[PDB]
């Protein structure tokens, strides 16, 4: 089995500048025919992957000009010139030369770097039905922000809570490079209703103080 | 070209799992069709092969995988099959149907090797407590993934945050948000559309003010 080592894990680039990612195997793949049977993919956020490149070099249909593919032997370099949004997400390399099997790489990972986005943070108190069940989350948003280093916190009657807390980010959107963030703090019914103000805080770069959003039971 | 991808689910340690795909866009009967798996901890592992009535229906399977899983391809249907006998815990994963090493993607189906019970989702409405407004959607307590989250039947899509879902002791929590502009909730109604295929549900919560 041939390994395919993609090199780094992620990278970050600004648009219209380029970008290149590496992509060793164990041997060369060189055929005894022609050259490689090395092909780039990419994989959107929430999509399956998408062959971009075949045979080292050749743009498979509908790819545009920006993306190219260098490399010969062990090592293989794909370059986007001018980078856009929607290239990000993640870029695999697989192999069909020395097969079976026919393996994969372990992705690199492209990040917009984009300017500074602080959160827009919303909070929810629980809603009549979870409480009928029993239940009590909060939930806190978190929504278009970048860089994706953020910490939240969760604060019940002024004093911090950190177990029942679920978190969640989704992926950089490529409409506007940011990521979101959804904080649930999870409660039983019994302990929701012994305590009135219920606050998550968000810390970020973009910021000196932190976000707060909050409210009391008492709405 | 498009290739669609059925069956998958929930499926007990040990037990066996049939996945169909359905191919369009291109002559199924020319091409190699291979099945391929994804998950955090694998990532992208190959796993079977098929060729033409012109190469013997040739087939290969990846080391593991070997002596449990058959693949098998209908060129009259124009779908490639993939049995999957004793299923472990490791076969967890998302699978996606693919024609040639590999040319076109199917969208993938999501198995879940555990031998807990199919669970549907409860929705709860997120309605606030700006010239925005945010409103969101909480599911909760669903076993396996995926459910897929929808605003207004996918009409509203550009102001849309969907959160990947987490598994805790509650089964699985996921949340959505959607943000559009205050002058327009709640006169024209916003509702989150939440479909579990595993349970064969569907959930529709129109998000009204508190």
């Known amino acids: 089995d041939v390994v395919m080592t993609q090199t780094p894990l992620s990278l970050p680039v600004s648009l219209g500048d380029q970008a290149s990612i590496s992509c060793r195997s164990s041997?060369?793949?060189?055929?005894?025919?022609?050259?490689?049977?090395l092909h780039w993919y990419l994989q959107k956020p929430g999509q399956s992957p998408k062959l971009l490149i075949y045979?080292?070099?050749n743009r498979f249909s509908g790819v545009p000009d920006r993306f190219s593919g260098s490399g010969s032997g062990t090592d293989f370099t794909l370059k986007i010139s001018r980078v856009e949004a929607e290239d990000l997400g993640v870029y695999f390399c697989?192999?069909?030369?020395?097969?079976?099997?026919?393996?994969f790489g372990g992705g690199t990972k492209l990040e917009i770097k984009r300017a500074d986005a602080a959160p827009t943070v919303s909070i929810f108190p629980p809603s009549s039905e979870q409480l009928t069940s029993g239940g009590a989350s909060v939930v806190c948003f978190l929504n278009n922000f970048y860089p994706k280093d953020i910490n939240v916190k969760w604060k019940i009657d002024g004093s911090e809570r950190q177990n029942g807390v679920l978190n969640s980010w989704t992926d950089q959107d490529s409409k506007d490079s940011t990521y979101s963030m959804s904080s649930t703090l999870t409660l039983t019914k019994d302990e929701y209703e012994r305590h009135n103000s219920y606050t998550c805080e968000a810390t970020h770069k973009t910021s000196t103080s932190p976000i707060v959003k909050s409210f009391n039971r008492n709405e | 070209v498009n290739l669609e991808e059925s069956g998958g689910g929930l499926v007990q340690p040990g037990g066996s799992m049939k996945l169909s795909c359905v191919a369009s866009?291109?002559?199924?009967?020319?091409?190699?069709m291979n099945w391929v798996r994804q998950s955090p901890e694998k990532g992208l592992e190959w796993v079977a092969q098929?060729?033409?009535?012109?190469?013997?229906?040739?087939?290969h399977y990846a080391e593991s995988v070997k002596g449990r899983f058959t693949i098998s391809r209908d060129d009259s249907k124009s779908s490639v099959y993939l049995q999957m006998n004793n299923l472990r815990a490791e076969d967890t994963g998302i699978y996606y149907c693919?024609?040639?090493?590999?040319?076109?993607w199917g969208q993938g189906t999501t198995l879940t090797v555990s031998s807990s019970k199919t669970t549907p989702p409860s929705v709860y409405p997120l309605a606030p407590g700006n010239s925005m407004v945010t409103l969101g959607c909480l599911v909760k307590g669903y076993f396996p993934e995926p459910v897929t989250v929808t605003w207004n039947s996918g009409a509203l899509s550009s102001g849309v945050h969907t959160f990947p879902a987490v598994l805790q002791s509650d089964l699985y929590t996921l949340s959505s948000s959607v943000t559009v502009p205050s002058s327009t909730w709640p006169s024209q109604t916003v509702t989150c559309n939440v479909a579990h295929p595993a349970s064969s549900t569907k959930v529709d919560k129109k998000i009204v003010p508190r």
């Open positions: 693919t024609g040639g090493v590999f040319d076109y």
């Open positions: 866009g291109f002559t199924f009967s020319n091409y190699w």
């Open positions: 098929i060729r033409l009535k012109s190469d013997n229906y040739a087939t």
């Open positions: 041997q060369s793949l060189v055929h005894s025919n022609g050259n490689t049977y």
């Open positions: 045979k080292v070099s």
């Open positions: 697989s192999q069909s030369t020395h097969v079976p099997p026919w393996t």
